[PDB]
């Protein structure tokens, strides 16, 4: 008797808030169905899991530098002098049922967040989804990326182990006291004295759990609101114009897909956090100034910054009894890639002199210069990332450690140019690949062997034919083209039935008839709509 | 409330109050003070720092040493328990002591003011990298090279620890050493330059 139950609780809501038209509008919103548009939500689904795991790791952690003696369950560190933060981090992993699993899922989700953001950024850049009126959204996303990087960096510095301590001494302390005028003032303001201090871990904890996630949440909210009210772009195709959206309604197709995708992302993250080990802090020790190991690697989203330090030469200046260290060059450099990233749309708008309120995307093959620039940037990023782990590559692969530095140093000026050239040529060649099929047709891969001994290939025209049998040339419309005959339906179903036993013939015939008729109806509907639009 | 003056005299030495960055654990607290080169041997409850002799380290060895005074010691009580912790957590405290083979003693170059900073074939250098402060402590005893595992800068032990590769531009600091009347290793004063990474108002 749920018909009477739902009819009563529906009237109670409409008589008090009257949200009929307002929710009816939201149930009818149309969203394009392209795989590439699912890249953005993964990050979102990664953020939520980072919040649930962040609340479960807030019931057991104690951020303090007060030095203690362990005397716990883990025997190899029995009697060692550590801090309260490190001891509590060991307690989470060894004394609480399922704590190791939770913190492993936390770290894995942290990695997925950054990876997803990078892929989403690549998608947005390459398809020209930033042009107009979607510049502010690009800017917001850029700020989100920067905040995500710094949020991640402050996270693994909390356990206060040897790796994180060595990283934070070199990055946050060494670089800080190199800035020309405000070098030592800023250092003493941040640390409240010399490097180790007694307030750094509490400050980082308060910064990591409260402030940066709050700013991230606000910015994400703004991002999603802008996307919702600016009517997501689409791609060129049959029935697509500058002033419409083609896809499916929110209720019920879109919501089910979103829920299923969230479930599968959660499944993958949970499965990955049990079978693979990440961040074993017990194999390390408590941070000591007079101790170090061989690796010394930050997380992959911070690797390019560390690799830039390793490759830049030792150039310093000494004016009037002062010092300008090497570390300055990176601090200027690091903030120069950011500035060039946020204000890219304006640069391109000024260069090409185009601002015409675009709603239709671009295929990367159609814009060679932008594609080449993106490829060059990706190449530089990859080289800087692989330069940070030049000591691990030199060990596992037999190559000199001195040789890797020079390889990277020379490469960071040579490899981008090669990538630019190759990308440009490749894009133009992919363009030329499309003009061959609009003019001659799809090559079926069949040879004919005419009576007089000539070999020809059978082509399948994509449009009307001429009186001589040669196809009428078609125009390019910014849409993909078929290149295989199997994708055009040159192949039926093997037969209705199970994997081992067939079904009665009549069922198979009826099902084939229905499917074929449904395909006719869909194509006809699209064609009719496209014909009525352009009258 | 979080703005502090870094160049404020807070550290008591043999010359009055001085700023933090000009001092370390090797700075004399009064004239004629004896600072011993100690090594980390045992557990925190078993006298973690003990004295050392020139006979202990042989040719092609290296040891890490810390500044230890007679005024601390054992760490049995709670008064010397917080004094032995400050020594081990000091930013600019650790020192590497190396012994050079007698065969290679003819190829040593001094640093114009540090011509008497060694006791025969024993040398002592700072263990803190002059680039960003990592413990540059990978000592290759045949090639005589000191390697930092952070940014791959190596220093030449035969010369005055001057850089030969990597992003380092300055040489490591040297500590003068000698022996005590009993036969233990002691210092002839602190470094004659600041140790660790650089900053804006460094050098003359």
């Amino acid at each position: 008797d749920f018909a009477k139950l739902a009819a009563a609780q529906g009237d109670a809501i409409d008589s008090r808030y009257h949200p009929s038209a307002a929710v009816r509008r939201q149930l009818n919103k149309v969203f394009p169905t392209h795989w590439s548009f699912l890249l953005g939500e993964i990050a979102l689904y990664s953020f939520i899991i980072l919040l649930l795991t962040g609340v479960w790791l807030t019931l057991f952690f104690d951020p303090s530098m007060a030095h203690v003696t362990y005397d716990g369950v883990y025997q190899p560190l029995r009697g060692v002098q550590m801090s309260r933060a490190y001891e509590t981090a060991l307690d989470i992993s060894f004394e609480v049922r399922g704590g190791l699993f939770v913190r492993q899922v936390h770290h894995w989700a942290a990695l997925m967040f950054a990876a997803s953001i990078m892929v989403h950024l690549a998608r947005i850049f390459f398809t020209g989804a930033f042009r107009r009126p979607r510049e502010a959204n690009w800017v917001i996303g850029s700020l989100l990326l920067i905040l995500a990087m710094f949020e991640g960096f402050f996270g693994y510095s909390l356990p206060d182990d040897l790796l994180s301590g060595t990283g934070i001494r070199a990055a946050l302390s060494g670089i800080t006291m190199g800035i020309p005028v405000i070098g030592t003032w800023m250092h003493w303001a941040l640390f409240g004295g010399d490097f180790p201090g007694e307030i750094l871990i509490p400050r980082l904890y308060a910064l990591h759990i409260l402030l940066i996630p709050g700013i991230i949440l606000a910015l994400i909210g703004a991002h999603l609101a802008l996307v919702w009210f600016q009517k997501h772009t689409q791609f060129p195709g049959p029935g697509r114009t500058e002033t419409n959206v083609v896809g499916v309604r929110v209720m019920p197709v879109f919501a089910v897909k979103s829920g299923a995708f969230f479930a599968m992302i959660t499944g993958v993250l949970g499965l990955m956090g049990g079978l693979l080990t990440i961040n074993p802090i017990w194999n390390l020790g408590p941070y000591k100034p007079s101790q170090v190991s061989a690796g010394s690697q930050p997380d992959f989203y911070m690797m390019w910054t560390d690799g830039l330090i390793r490759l830049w030469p030792a150039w310093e200046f000494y004016p009037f009894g002062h010092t300008i260290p090497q570390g300055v060059w990176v601090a200027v450099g690091m903030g120069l890639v950011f500035a060039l990233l946020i204000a890219y749309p304006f640069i391109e708008k000024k260069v090409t002199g185009d601002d015409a309120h675009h709603n239709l995307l671009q295929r990367p093959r159609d814009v060679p210069v932008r594609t080449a620039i993106g490829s060059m940037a990706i190449a530089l990023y990859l080289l800087l990332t692989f330069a940070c782990m030049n000591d691990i590559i030199a060990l596992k692969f037999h190559i000199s450690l001195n040789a890797t530095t020079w390889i990277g140093r020379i490469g960071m000026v040579v490899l981008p140019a090669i990538v630019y050239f190759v990308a440009y040529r490749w894009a133009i060649s992919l363009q030329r690949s499309d003009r061959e099929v609009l003019e001659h047709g799809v090559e079926t891969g069949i040879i004919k062997r005419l009576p007089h001994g000539a070999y020809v290939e059978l082509h399948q025209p994509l449009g009307p034919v001429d009186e001589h049998g040669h196809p009428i040339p078609l125009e390019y419309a910014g849409a993909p083209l078929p290149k295989r005959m199997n994708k055009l339906g040159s192949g039926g179903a093997p037969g209705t039935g199970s994997f081992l036993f067939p079904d009665p013939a009549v069922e198979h015939e009826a099902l084939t008839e229905a499917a074929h008729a449904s395909e006719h109806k869909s194509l006809t509907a699209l064609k009719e709509h496209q014909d009525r639009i352009h009258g | 409330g979080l703005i502090k003056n870094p160049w404020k005299p807070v550290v008591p030495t043999a010359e009055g109050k001085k700023a933090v960055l000009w001092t370390s654990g090797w700075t004399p607290r009064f004239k004629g003070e004896t600072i011993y080169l100690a090594r980390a041997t045992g557990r925190p409850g078993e006298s973690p720092f003990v004295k050392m002799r020139p006979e202990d380290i042989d040719a092609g060895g290296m040891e890490t040493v810390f500044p230890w005074r007679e005024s601390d010691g054992d760490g049995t009580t709670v008064e010397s328990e917080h004094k032995l912790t400050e020594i081990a957590m000091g930013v600019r405290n650790p020192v590497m002591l190396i012994r050079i083979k007698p065969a290679d003693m003819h190829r040593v170059i001094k640093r114009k003011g540090q011509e008497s900073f060694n006791f025969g074939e024993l040398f002592a250098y700072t263990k803190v990298c002059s680039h960003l402060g990592c413990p540059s402590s990978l000592y290759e005893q045949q090639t005589y090279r000191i390697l930092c595992p952070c940014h791959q800068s190596q220093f030449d032990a035969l010369e005055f620890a001057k850089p030969i590769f990597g992003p380092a531009a300055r040489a490591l600091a040297q500590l003068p050493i000698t022996i005590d009347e009993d036969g233990y290793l002691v210092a002839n004063g602190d470094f004659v330059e600041p140790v660790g990474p650089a900053f804006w108002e460094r050098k003359s």
Binding site: - | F30, T34, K110, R111, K112, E115, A171, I177, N188, S204
Partner: peptide
């Protein structure tokens, strides 16, 4: 640029004297 105050020498240098040590804080 090269760091001023980082120079090699050609001076022999003497063996350090035995440490005596002033007894107590002055």
């Amino acid at each position: 640029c090269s760091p001023p105050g980082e120079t090699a020498s050609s001076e022999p240098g003497t063996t350090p004297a035995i440490w005596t040590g002033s007894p107590s804080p002055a």
